[PDB]
Design a protein around this ligand. Structure first.
Ligand SMILES: O=C(O)Cc1coc2cc(Nc3ccccc3)ccc12
Length: 188
């Protein structure tokens, strides 16, 4: 076959019921996740190849960066609750990995302030129980698949993308093969 279990993707032998259709996991500490966002635009390219209006979800993970890693999971929960993911993704990646100006929860907050989120708006969300539940949701989804590596994408809680079996000599071909594989897996 052209797509084979163990090549472009792997199959969870403990499938996850009720999981989002397309679920991505990342960390602002994760170097390939940086490339996935700024260089390859994996998420948008996958969306362009999926049918109209299918749900794509993207969650942060705790297991990179220790204490700040957990702060970033809470900040991503804030970003999801306010709907400002498109405004803070790039400055958070660059603040952590390029300029290395993100060293504390206060530095994370500064990114939101600079992006136009009001201070009282950010603090109220940060301490809200809705965000507490969003943090729990992100942790549970990662736990459901015993996730230990990022970037990761799962399709229908059953298939895990395997980018290690994709040619990386051409970045555009890589993204296309990745997106086409997600489309193929979604149609199973
Ligand atoms: O090797 C791995 O663990 C799999 C993997 C995960 O995310 C990646 C991102 C890239 N980025 C890239 C850079 C230049 C050309 C093509 C791709 C490459 C491999 C991976």
């Amino acid at each position: 076959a052209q797509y084979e279990d163990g090549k472009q993707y792997t199959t969870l032998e403990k499938p996850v019921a009720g999981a989002p259709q397309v679920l991505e996991f990342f960390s602002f500490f994760c170097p390939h996740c940086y490339q996935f966002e700024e260089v390859l635009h994996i998420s948008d390219n996958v969306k362009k190849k999926l049918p109209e209006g299918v749900k794509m979800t993207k969650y942060h993970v705790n297991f990179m960066g220790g204490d700040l890693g957990k702060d970033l999971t809470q900040a991503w929960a804030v970003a999801m609750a306010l709907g400002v993911e498109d405004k803070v993704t790039v400055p958070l990646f660059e603040g952590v990995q390029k300029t290395q100006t993100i060293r504390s929860a206060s530095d994370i907050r500064d990114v939101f302030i600079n992006a136009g989120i009001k201070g009282e708006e950010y603090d109220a969300a940060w301490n809200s129980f809705v965000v507490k539940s969003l943090v729990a949701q992100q942790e549970k989804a990662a736990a459901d698949v015993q996730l230990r590596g990022v970037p990761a994408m799962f399709v229908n809680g059953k298939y895990q993308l395997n980018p290690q079996g994709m040619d990386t000599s051409n970045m555009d071909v890589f993204v296309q093969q990745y997106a086409d594989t997600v489309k193929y897996l979604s149609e199973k």
